[PDB]
Every structure is written in structure tokens, then in C-alpha cells.
Amino acid sequence: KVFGRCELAAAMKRHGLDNYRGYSLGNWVCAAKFESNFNTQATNRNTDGSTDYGILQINSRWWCNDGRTPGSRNLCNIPCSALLSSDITASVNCAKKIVSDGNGMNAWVAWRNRCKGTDVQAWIRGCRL
């Protein structure tokens, strides 16, 4: 599913991401924009053989099981395919664990490089939330 901007903001709020670990909703929408362009079915293969999945491009080295990332963990206790669903619940619940891991949203390199320190509230501006 390719979400609209305000549609994703509302779904993220519904699932408790607004201000989670202190990160306002616009931070999460901005991260999803640059990770996946709001497409739940986005995937990306990394040089090390791991794969990133879903709207927030969550990686199989630590967070989900895809059966093809040797030595990896599955700390969100989900198949990576669950991160591709039109229902964002699994992505949101896993992102909550990731953002609590110690480095906040810096875990998403694209958030650090493209959202951090910018006017992220613009990503939710105009939306009925």
C-alpha cells in the first residue's frame, strides 16, 4: 500500500507513535517519506546480505526474521514479511523497539541525514489529526 502523507500521519498517531520517545509525528512521517516513499511494500538489499522492509525500512540483521540473514536476530519477533502489510501495526510496534535501543531515531540513517534538525512539522501541516 502506498499511503498518502496525512493518511500515514493519522495511522501513525492511531498506533501511538506521536511523541513516542519524544519524537513528534512529523519526524516519523519524514523518516517514512525518505525510507520508503510511504510504500509498505518497499524492500532494499544491503551489501552485507541483510534486507530492509516496509514503510520504515526495518532491517533483518537485528529486528525481523527473513531466513536469509546469517547470524542475525529477530528482536521484534516477526517475519520480515509482516513489515510489508497494508496494516502498519507490525512496523509501528517494531519501530517503537528500535527507537528505544539507545540512539533514538539516528537508527534510521536517512532520518539523521534528511529529517533531523529540519522543520519536520511541515510533514503533518494541514492534516486533520
Instruction: Provide the annotated binding site for substrate.
Output: 101
> Which residue of the chain is nearest Cl ion when measured via CB?
121
What residues from 60 to 79 belong to the interface with Na ion (CB under 5 A)? 60, 65, 69, 72, 74
**Euclidean distance between CA atoms 18 and 92, whole angstroms:** 11
DSSP 75-126: TT-SBGGGGGSSSTHHHHHHHHHHHTSSSGGGGSHHHHHHTTTS-GGGGTTT
User: Minimum Å distance from CB 79 to Na ion?
Assistant: 10
Site string for Na ion, 28-67 (x = CB under 5 A): --------------------------------x----x--
Known catalytic residues? 35, 52
